[PDB]
Design a protein around this ligand. Sequence first.
Ligand SMILES: O=C1Cc2cc(Nc3nc(Cl)ncc3Br)ccc2N1
Ligand SMILES: O=C1Cc2cc(Nc3nc(Cl)ncc3Br)ccc2N1
Ligand SMILES: [Cl-]
Ligand SMILES: [Cl-]
Lengths: 4, 4, 124, 124
Amino acid sequence: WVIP
Amino acid sequence: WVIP
Amino acid sequence: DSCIQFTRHASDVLLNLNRLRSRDILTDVVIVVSREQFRAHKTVLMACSGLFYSIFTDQLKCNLSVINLDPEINPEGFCILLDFMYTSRLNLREGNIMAVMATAMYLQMEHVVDTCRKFIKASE
Amino acid sequence: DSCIQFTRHASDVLLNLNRLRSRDILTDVVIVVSREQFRAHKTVLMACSGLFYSIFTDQLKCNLSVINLDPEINPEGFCILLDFMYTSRLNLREGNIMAVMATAMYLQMEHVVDTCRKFIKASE
Ligand SMILES: O=C1Cc2cc(Nc3nc(Cl)ncc3Br)ccc2N1
Ligand SMILES: O=C1Cc2cc(Nc3nc(Cl)ncc3Br)ccc2N1
Ligand SMILES: [Cl-]
Ligand SMILES: [Cl-]
């Protein structure tokens, strides 16, 4: 999971 | 396009 | 093999599937969550959820145009997860994390369940 | 928004759509290319091809279970492109590049046409  |  | 690969292809396909969803094109099922209805593509639901995969591979249920979810399922949690299925983006917030995790467990969306458990463990 | 994103989601969805294709699950159209038949999902074809997008948004053609391609279309070129749609991998070879490019132009698959033109320009 990432900060888009 | 890339070499997978 | 000696194939080449187009890096953005999977993302572009999903973006287009979401555009079809937004315009209600070739949607083939309604998911009923209490008083709310959500139109979607059976294939996308199966590709994202262990529960929908089991439902639409069943010889009788594969032909249903309406699927009723368990009454304990929160429509907002479902909406957030349906958006995630079609976009890879999860709108996880302090106010919705419990409903989202409960819905992801019921839908059998393992990666969503995992991030919810981690975000919950960080706040305790 | 304040969304989080699961990097591998789009690729995982496409992998699952290809698994459904391989087991012939919920395929809803046959594409006829001369003597060959290819089963697929209308939504995936529309998401990858400007030609299929135009075909299945047509109020009459959206309901057809069989689509016949132009007789000039090579079945192997089509097969390679159908595999690309479901996997992001293109099996481009000296022996098939002309058929693949001609098929990608007819199908309106701009990124495939672009790499074919570049590979052809390099060999001249
Ligand atoms: O957390 C998750 C997400 C998910 C998706 C599917 N979907 C499919 N799985 C397989 Cl093996 N083939 C085709 C399809 Br469609 C099955 C289980 C799960 N569990
Ligand atoms: O080279 C390409 C690939 C492609 C795909 C689509 N598909 C869609 N386009 C739009 Cl805007 N909305 C929903 C869908 Br499905 C249209 C044109 C093209 N040209
Ligand atoms: Cl997931
Ligand atoms: Cl393309």
